[PDB]
PDB file of C-alpha atoms and ligand atoms in Angstrom:
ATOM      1  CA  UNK U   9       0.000   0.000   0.000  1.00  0.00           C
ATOM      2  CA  UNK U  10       2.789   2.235   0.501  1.00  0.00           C
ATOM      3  CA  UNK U  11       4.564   3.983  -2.549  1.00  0.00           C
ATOM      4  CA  UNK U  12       7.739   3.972  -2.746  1.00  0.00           C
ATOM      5  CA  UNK U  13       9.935   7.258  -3.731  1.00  0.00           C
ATOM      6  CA  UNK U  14      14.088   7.223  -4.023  1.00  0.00           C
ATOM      7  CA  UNK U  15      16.087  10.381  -4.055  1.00  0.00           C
ATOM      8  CA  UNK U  16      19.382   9.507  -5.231  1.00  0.00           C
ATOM      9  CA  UNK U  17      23.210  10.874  -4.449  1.00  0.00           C
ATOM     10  CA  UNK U  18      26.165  11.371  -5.558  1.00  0.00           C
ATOM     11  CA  UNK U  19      27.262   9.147  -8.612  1.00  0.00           C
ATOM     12  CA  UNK U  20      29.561   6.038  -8.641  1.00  0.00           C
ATOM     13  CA  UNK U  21      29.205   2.428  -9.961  1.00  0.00           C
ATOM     14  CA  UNK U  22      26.622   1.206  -6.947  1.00  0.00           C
ATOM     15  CA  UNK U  23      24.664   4.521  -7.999  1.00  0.00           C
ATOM     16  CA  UNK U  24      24.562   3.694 -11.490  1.00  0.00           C
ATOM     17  CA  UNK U  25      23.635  -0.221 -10.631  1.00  0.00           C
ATOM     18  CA  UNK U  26      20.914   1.790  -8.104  1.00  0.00           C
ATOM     19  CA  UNK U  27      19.508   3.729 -11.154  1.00  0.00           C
ATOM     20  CA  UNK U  28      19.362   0.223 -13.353  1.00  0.00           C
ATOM     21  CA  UNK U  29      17.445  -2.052 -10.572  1.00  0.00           C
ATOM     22  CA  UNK U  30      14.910   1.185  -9.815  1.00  0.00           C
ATOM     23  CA  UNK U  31      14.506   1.404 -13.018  1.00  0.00           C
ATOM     24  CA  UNK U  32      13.589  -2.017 -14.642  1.00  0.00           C
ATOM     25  CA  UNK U  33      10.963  -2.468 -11.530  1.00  0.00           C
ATOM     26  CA  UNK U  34       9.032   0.750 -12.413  1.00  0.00           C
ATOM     27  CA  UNK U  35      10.074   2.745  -9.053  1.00  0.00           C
ATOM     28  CA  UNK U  36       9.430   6.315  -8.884  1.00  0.00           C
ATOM     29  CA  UNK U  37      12.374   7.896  -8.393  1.00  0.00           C
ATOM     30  CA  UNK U  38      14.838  10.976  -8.852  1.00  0.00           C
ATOM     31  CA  UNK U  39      18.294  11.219 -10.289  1.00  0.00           C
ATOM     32  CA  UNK U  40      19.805  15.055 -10.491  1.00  0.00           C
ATOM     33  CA  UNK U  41      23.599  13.467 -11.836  1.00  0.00           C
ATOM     34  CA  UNK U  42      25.020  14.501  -8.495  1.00  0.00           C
ATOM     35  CA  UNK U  43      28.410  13.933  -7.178  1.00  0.00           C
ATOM     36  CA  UNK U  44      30.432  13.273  -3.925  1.00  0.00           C
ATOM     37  CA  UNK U  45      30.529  16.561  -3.409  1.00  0.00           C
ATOM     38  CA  UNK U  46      27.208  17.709  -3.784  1.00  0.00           C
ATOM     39  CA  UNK U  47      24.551  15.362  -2.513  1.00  0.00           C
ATOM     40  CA  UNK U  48      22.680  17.428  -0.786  1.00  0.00           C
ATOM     41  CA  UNK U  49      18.554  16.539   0.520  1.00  0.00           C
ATOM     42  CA  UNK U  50      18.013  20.261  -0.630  1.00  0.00           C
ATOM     43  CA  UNK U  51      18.997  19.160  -4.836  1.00  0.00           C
ATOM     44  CA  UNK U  52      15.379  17.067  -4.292  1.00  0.00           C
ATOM     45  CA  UNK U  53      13.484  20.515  -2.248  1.00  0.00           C
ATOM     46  CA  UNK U  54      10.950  20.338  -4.798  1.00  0.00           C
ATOM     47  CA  UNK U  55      10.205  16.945  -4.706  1.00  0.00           C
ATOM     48  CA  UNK U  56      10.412  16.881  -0.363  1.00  0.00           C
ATOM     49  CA  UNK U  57       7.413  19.142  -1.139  1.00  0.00           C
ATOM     50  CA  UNK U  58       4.947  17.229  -3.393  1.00  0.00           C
ATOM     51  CA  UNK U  59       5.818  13.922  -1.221  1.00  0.00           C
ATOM     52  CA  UNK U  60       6.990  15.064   2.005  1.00  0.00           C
ATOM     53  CA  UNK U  61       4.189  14.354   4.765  1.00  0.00           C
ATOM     54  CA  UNK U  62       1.982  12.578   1.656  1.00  0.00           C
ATOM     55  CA  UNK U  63       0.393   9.615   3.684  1.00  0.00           C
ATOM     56  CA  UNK U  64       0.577   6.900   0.738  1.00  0.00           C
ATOM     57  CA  UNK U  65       4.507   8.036  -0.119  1.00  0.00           C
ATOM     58  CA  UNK U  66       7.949   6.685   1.574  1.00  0.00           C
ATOM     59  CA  UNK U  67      11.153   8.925   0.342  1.00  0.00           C
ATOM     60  CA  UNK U  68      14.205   7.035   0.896  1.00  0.00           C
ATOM     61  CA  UNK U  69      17.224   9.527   0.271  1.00  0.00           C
ATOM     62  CA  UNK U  70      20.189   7.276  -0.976  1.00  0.00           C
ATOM     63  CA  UNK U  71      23.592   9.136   0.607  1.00  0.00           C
ATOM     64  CA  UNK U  72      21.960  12.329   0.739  1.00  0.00           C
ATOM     65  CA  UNK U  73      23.633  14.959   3.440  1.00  0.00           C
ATOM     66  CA  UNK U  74      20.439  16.400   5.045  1.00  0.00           C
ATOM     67  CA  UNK U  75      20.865  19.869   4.585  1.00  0.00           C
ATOM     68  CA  UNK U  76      17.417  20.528   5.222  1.00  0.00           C
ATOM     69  CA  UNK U  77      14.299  18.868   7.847  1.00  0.00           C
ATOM     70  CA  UNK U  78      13.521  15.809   6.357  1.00  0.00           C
ATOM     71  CA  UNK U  79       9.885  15.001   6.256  1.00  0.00           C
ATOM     72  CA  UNK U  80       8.173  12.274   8.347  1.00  0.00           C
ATOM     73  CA  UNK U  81       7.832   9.887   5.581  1.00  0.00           C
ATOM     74  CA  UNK U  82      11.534   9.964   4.836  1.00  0.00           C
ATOM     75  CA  UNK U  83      13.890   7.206   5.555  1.00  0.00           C
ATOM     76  CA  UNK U  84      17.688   7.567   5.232  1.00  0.00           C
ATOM     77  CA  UNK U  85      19.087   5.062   3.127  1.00  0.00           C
ATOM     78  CA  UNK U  86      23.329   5.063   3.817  1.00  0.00           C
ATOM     79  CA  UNK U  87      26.230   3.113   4.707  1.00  0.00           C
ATOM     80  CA  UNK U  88      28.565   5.941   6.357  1.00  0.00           C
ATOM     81  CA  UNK U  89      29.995   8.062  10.194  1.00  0.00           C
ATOM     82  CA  UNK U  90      27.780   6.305  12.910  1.00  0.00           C
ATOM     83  CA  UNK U  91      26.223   3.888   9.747  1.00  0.00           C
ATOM     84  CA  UNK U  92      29.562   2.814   8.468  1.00  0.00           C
ATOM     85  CA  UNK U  93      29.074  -0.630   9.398  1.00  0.00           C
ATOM     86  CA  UNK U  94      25.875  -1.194   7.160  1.00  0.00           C
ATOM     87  CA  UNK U  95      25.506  -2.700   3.866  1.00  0.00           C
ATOM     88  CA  UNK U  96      26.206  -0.481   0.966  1.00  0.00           C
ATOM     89  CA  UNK U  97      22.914   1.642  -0.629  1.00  0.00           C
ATOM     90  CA  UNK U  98      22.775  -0.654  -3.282  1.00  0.00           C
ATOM     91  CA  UNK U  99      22.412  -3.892  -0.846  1.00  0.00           C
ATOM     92  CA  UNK U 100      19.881  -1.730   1.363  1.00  0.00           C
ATOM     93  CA  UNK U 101      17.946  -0.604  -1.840  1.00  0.00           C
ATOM     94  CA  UNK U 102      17.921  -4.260  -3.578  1.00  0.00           C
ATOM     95  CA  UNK U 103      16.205  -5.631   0.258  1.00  0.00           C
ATOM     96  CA  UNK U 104      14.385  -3.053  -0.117  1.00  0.00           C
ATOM     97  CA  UNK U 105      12.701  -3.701  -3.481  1.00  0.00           C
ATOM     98  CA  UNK U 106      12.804  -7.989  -2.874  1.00  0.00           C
ATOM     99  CA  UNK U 107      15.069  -7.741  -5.677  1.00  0.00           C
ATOM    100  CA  UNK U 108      17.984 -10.603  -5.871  1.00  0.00           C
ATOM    101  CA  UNK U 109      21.979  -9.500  -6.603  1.00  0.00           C
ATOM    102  CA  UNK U 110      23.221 -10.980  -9.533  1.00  0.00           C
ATOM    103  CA  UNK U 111      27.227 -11.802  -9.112  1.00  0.00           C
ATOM    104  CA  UNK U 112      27.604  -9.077 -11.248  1.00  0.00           C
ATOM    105  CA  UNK U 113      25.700  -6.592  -8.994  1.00  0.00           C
ATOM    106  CA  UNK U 114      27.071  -8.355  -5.886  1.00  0.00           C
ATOM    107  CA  UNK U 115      30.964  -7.460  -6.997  1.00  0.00           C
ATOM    108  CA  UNK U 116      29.522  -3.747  -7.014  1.00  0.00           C
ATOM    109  CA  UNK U 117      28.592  -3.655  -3.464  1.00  0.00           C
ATOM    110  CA  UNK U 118      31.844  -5.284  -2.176  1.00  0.00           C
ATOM    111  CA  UNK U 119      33.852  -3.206  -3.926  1.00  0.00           C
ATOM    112  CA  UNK U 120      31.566  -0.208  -2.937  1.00  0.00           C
ATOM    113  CA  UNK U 121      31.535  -1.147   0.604  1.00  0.00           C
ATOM    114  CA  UNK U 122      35.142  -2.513   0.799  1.00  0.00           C
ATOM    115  CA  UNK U 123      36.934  -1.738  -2.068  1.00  0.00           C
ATOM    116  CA  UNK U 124      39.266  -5.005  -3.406  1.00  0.00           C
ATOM    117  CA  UNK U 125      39.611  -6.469  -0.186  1.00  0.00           C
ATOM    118  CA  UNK U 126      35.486  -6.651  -0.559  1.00  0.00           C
ATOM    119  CA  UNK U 127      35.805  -7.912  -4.187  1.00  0.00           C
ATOM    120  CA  UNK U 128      38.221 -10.678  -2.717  1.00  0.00           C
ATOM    121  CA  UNK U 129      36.842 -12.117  -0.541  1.00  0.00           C
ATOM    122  CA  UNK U 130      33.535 -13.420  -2.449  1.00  0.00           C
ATOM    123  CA  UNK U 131      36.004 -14.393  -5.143  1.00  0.00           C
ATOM    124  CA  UNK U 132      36.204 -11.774  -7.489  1.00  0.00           C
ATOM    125  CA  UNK U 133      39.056 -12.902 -10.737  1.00  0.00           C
ATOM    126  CA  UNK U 134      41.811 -10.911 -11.452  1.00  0.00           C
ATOM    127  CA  UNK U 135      39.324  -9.284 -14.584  1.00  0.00           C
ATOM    128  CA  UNK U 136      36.392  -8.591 -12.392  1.00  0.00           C
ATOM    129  CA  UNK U 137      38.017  -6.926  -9.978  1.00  0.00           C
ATOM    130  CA  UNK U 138      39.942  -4.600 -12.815  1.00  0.00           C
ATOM    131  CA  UNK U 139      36.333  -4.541 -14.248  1.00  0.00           C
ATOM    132  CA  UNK U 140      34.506  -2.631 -11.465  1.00  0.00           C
ATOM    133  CA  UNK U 141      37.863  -0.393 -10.664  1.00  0.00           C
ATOM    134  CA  UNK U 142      37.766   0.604 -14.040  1.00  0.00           C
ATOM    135  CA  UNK U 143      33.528   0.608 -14.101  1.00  0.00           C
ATOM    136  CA  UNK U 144      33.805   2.961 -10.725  1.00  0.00           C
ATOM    137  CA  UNK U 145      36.139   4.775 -11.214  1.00  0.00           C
ATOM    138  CA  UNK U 146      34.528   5.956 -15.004  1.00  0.00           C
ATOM    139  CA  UNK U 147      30.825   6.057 -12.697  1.00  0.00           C
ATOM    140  CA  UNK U 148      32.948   8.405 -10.555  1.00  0.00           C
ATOM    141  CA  UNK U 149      33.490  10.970 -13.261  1.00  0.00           C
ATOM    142  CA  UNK U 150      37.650  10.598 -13.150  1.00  0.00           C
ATOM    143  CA  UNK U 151      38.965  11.479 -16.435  1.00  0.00           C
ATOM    144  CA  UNK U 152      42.785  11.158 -18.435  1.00  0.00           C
ATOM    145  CA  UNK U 153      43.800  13.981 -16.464  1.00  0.00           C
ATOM    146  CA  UNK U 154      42.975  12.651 -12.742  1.00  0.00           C
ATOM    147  CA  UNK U 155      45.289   9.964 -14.413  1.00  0.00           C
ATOM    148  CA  UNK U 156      48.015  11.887 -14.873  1.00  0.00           C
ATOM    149  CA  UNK U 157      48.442  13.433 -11.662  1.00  0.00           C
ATOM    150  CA  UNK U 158      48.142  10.625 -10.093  1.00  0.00           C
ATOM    151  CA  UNK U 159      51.089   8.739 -12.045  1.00  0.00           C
ATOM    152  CA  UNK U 160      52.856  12.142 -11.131  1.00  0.00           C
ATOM    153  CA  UNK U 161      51.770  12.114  -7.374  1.00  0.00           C
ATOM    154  CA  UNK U 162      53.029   8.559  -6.951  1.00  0.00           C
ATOM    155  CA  UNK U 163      56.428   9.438  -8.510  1.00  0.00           C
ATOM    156  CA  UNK U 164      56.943  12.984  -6.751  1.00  0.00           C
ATOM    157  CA  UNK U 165      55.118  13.329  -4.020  1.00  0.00           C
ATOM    158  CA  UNK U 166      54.939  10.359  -2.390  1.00  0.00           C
ATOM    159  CA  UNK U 167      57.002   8.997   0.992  1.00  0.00           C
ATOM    160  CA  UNK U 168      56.554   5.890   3.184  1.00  0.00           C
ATOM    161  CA  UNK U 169      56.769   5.957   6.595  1.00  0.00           C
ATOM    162  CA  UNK U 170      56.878   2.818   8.340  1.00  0.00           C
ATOM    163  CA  UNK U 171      53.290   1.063   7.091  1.00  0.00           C
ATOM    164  CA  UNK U 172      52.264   4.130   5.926  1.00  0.00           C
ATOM    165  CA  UNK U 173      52.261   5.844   2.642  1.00  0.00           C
ATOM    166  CA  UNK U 174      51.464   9.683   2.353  1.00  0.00           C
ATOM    167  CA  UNK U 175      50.843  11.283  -0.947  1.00  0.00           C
ATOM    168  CA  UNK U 176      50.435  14.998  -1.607  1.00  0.00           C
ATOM    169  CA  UNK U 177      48.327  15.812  -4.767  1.00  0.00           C
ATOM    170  CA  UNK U 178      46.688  18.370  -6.619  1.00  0.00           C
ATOM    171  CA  UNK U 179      44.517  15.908  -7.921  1.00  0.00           C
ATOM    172  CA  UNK U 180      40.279  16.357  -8.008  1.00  0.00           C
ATOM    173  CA  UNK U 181      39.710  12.312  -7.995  1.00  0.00           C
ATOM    174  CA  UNK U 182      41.781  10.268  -5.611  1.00  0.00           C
ATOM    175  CA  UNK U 183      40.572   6.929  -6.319  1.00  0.00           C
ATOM    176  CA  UNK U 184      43.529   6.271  -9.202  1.00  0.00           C
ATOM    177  CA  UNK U 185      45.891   6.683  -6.391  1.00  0.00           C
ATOM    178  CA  UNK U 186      44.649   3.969  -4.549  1.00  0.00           C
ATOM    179  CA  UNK U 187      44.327   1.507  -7.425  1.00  0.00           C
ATOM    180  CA  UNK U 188      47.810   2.570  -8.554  1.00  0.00           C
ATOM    181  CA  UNK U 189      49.082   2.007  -4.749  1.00  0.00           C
ATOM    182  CA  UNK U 190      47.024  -1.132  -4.108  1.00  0.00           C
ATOM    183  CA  UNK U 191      47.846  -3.358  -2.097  1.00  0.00           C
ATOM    184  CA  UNK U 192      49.125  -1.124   1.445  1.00  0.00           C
ATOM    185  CA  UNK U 193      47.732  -1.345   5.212  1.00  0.00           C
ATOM    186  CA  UNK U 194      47.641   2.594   5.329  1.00  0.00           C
ATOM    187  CA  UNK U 195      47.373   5.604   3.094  1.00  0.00           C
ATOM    188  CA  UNK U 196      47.079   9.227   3.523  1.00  0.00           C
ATOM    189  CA  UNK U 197      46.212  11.952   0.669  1.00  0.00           C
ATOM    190  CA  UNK U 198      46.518  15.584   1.437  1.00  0.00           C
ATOM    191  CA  UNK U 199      45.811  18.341  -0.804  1.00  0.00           C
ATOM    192  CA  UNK U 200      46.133  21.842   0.766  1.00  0.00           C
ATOM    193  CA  UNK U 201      42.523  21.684   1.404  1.00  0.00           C
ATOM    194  CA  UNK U 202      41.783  18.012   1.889  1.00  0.00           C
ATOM    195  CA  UNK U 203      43.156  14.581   3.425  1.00  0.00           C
ATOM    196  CA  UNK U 204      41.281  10.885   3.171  1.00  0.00           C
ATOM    197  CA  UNK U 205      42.769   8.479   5.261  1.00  0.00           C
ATOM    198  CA  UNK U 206      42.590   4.508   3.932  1.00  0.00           C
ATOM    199  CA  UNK U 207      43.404   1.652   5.980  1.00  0.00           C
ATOM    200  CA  UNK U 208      43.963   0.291   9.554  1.00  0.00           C
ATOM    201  CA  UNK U 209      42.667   1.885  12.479  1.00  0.00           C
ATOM    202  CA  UNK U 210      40.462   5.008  11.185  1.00  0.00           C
ATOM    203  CA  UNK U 211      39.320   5.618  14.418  1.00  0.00           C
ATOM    204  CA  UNK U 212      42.365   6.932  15.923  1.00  0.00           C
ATOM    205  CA  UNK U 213      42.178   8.947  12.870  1.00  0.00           C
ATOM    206  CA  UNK U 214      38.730  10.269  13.947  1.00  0.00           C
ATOM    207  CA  UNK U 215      40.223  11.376  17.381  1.00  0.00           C
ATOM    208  CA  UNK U 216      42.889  13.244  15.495  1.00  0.00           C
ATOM    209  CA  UNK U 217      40.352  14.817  13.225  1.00  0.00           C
ATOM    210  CA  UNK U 218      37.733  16.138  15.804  1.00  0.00           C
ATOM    211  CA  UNK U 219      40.909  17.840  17.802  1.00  0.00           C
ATOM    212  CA  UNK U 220      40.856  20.191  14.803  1.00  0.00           C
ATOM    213  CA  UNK U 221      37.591  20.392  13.081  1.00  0.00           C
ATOM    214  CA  UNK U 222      33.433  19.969  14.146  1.00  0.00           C
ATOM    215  CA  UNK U 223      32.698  16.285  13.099  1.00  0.00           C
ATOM    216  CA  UNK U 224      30.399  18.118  10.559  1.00  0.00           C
ATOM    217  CA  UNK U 225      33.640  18.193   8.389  1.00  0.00           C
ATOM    218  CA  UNK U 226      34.389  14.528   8.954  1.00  0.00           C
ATOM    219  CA  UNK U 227      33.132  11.429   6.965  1.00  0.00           C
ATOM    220  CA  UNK U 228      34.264   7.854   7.316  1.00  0.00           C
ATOM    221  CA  UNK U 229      32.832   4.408   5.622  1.00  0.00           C
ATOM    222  CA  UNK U 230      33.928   1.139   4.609  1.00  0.00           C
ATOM    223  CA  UNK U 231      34.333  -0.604   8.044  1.00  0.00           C
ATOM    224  CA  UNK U 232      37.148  -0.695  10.648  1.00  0.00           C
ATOM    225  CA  UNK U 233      40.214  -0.823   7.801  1.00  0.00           C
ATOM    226  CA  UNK U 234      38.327   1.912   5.426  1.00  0.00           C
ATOM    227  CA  UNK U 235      38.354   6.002   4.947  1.00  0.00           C
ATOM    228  CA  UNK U 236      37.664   8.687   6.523  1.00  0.00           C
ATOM    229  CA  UNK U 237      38.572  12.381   5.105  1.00  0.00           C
ATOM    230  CA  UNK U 238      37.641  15.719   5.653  1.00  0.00           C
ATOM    231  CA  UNK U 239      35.141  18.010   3.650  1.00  0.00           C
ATOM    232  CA  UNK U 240      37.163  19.977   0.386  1.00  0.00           C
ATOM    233  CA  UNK U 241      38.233  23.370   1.696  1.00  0.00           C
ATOM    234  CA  UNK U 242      36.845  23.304   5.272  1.00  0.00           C
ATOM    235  CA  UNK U 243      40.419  22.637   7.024  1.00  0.00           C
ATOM    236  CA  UNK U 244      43.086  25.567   6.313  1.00  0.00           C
ATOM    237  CA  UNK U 245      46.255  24.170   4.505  1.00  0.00           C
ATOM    238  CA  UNK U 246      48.451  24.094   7.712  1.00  0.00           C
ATOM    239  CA  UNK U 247      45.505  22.439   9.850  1.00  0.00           C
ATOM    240  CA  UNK U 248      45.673  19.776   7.262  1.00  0.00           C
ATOM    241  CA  UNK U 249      49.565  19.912   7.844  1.00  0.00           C
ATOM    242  CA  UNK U 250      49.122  19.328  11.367  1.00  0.00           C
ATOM    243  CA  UNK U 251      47.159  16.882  10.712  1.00  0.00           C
ATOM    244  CA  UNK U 252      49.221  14.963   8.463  1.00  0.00           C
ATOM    245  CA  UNK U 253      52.248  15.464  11.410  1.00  0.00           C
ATOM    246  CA  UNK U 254      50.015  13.996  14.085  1.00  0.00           C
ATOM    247  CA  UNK U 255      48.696  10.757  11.384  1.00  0.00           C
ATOM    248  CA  UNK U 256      52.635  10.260  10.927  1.00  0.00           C
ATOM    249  CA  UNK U 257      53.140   9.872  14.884  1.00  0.00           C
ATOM    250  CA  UNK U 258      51.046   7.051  14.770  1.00  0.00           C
ATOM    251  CA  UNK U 259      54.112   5.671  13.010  1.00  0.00           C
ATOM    252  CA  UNK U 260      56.094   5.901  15.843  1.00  0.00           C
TER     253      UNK U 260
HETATM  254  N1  LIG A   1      39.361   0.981   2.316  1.00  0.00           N
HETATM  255  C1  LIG A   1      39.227   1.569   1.103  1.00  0.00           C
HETATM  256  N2  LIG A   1      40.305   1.987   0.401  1.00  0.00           N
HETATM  257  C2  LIG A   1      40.184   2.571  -0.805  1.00  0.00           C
HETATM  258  N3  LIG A   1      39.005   2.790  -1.411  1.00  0.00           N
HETATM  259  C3  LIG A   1      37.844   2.421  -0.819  1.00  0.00           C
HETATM  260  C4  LIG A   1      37.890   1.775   0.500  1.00  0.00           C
HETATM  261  N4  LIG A   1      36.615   1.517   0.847  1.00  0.00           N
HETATM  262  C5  LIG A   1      35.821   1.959  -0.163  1.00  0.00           C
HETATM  263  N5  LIG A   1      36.557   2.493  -1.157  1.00  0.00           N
HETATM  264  C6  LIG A   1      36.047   3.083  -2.419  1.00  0.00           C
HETATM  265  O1  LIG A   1      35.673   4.444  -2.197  1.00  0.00           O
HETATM  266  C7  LIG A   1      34.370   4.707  -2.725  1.00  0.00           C
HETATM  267  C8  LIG A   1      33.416   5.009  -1.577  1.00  0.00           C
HETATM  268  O2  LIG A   1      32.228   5.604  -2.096  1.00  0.00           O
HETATM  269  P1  LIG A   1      31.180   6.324  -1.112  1.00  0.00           P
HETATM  270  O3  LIG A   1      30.644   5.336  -0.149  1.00  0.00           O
HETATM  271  O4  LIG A   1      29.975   6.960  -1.968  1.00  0.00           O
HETATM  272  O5  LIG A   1      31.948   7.480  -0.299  1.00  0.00           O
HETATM  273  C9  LIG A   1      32.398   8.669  -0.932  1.00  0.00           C
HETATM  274  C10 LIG A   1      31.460   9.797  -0.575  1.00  0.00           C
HETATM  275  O6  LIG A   1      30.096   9.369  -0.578  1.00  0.00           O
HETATM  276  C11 LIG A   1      31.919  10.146   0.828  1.00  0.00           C
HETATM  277  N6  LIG A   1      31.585  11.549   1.167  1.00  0.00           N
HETATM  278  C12 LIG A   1      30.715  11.928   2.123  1.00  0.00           C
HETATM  279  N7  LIG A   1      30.626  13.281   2.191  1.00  0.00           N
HETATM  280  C13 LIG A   1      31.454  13.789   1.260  1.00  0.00           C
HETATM  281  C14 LIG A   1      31.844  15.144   0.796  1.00  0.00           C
HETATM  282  N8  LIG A   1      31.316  16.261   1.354  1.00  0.00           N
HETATM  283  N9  LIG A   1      32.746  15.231  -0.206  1.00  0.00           N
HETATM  284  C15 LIG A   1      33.281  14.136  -0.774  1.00  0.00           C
HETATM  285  N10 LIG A   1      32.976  12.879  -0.405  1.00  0.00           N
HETATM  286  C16 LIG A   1      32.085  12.643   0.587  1.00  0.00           C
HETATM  287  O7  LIG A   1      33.336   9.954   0.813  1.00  0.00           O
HETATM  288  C17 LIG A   1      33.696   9.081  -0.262  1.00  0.00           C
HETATM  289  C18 LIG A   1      34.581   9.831  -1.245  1.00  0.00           C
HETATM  290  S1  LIG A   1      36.210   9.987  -0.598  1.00  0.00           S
HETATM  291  C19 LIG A   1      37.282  10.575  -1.869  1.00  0.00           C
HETATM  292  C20 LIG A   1      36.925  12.009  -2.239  1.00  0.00           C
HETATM  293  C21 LIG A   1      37.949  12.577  -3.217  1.00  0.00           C
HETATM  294  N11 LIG A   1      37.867  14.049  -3.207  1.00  0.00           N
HETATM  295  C22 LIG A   1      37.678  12.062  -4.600  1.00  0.00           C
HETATM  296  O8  LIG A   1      36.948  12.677  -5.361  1.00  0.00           O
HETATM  297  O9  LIG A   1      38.228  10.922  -5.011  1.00  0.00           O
HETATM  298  C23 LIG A   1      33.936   3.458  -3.470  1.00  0.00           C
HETATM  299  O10 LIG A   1      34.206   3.625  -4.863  1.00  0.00           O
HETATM  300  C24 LIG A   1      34.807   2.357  -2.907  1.00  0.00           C
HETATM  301  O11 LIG A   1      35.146   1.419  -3.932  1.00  0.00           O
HETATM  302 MN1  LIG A   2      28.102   6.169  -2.814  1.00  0.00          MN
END
């Protein structure tokens, strides 16, 4: 009896598989191309109007930052900060709808939940995992030229100390660092605006963080060995230096 109404995020391969499954079961739903950056309730204000408080209507936001009072009818659908241990969207949304993961669709949310080290461990071939990398990473809107700075980020501006590797970049898309870099146990990318921490132990990361910023800054996902980074432009360049000096005494 209920009708059911998605608002969707920011775009990436689980997204894209999100738009597919919503669409071949005739869902209503909403898809303003947003990014990681931008996935904000207030893109869908119109439609929290005609639906919000609507007694037949459910809106499920999928990794929407809730910018604005969501309605009573509105469920948060997302897999990240004090949710980081559920399923990815596109798990949640699939439950949601009764519909059944293919392996296909499955690979997507391992590798959206936990990366390669998701992908491996149902079993994911040597292809499929460079299959989704390459499927994200395209979903994710990185181009030739987030390719080249990372290739030149690697080379230049890149140190290791102890399990850790830190990278400084003035790349847009970091995710062809990691694939570049992968497999390590840590790894930190700073821009002078922005860090994302991957690996071990991002909760000692978190009590680093909050020393320096409101946790409104801070995001973290893919379980206990994950990310976490801070918000583009939030953190002065030498907070994010100090930052980076207190990640690298973890080292010690
Ligand atoms: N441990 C891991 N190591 C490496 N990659 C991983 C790991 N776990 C997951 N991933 C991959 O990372 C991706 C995670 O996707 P998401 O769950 O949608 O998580 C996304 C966003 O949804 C989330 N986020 C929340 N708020 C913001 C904000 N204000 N700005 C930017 N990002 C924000 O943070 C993640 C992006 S973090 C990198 C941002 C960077 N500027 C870039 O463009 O590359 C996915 O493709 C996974 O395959
Ligand atoms: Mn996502």
């Amino acid at each position: 009896i209920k009708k059911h109404l998605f608002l969707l995020g920011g775009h990436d391969l689980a997204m894209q598989t999100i738009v597919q499954i919503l669409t071949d079961r005739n869902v209503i739903f909403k898809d303003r191309y947003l990014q990681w950056d931008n996935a904000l309730l207030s893109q869908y204000e119109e439609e929290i109007q005609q639906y919000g408080n609507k007694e037949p209507f459910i809106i499920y936001g999928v990794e929407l930052k809730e910018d604005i009072t969501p309605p009573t009818n509105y469920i948060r659908i997302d897999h990240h900060n004090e949710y980081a241990t559920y399923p990815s969207a596109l798990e949640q949304v699939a439950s949601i709808l009764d519909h059944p993961l293919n392996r296909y669709q499955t690979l997507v949310a391992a590798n959206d939940k936990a990366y390669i080290p998701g992908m491996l461990e149902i079993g994911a071939s040597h292809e499929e995992i460079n299959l989704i990398r390459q499927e994200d990473r395209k979903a994710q809107g990185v181009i030739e030229d987030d390719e080249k700075l990372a290739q030149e980020a690697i080379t230049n501006g890149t140190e290791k100390i102890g399990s850790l590797y830190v990278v400084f970049t003035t790349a847009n898309k970091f995710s062809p660092i990691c694939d570049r870099l992968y497999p390590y146990e840590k790894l930190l990318i700073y821009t002078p605006n922005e860090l994302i921490y991957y690996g071990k132990g991002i909760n000692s990361i978190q009590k680093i963080l909050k020393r320096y910023t409101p946790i409104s800054n801070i995001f973290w996902g893919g379980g206990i060995n994950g990310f976490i980074g801070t918000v583009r432009n939030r953190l002065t360049t030498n907070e994010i230096l100090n930052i980076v000096e207190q990640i690298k005494l973890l080292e010690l």
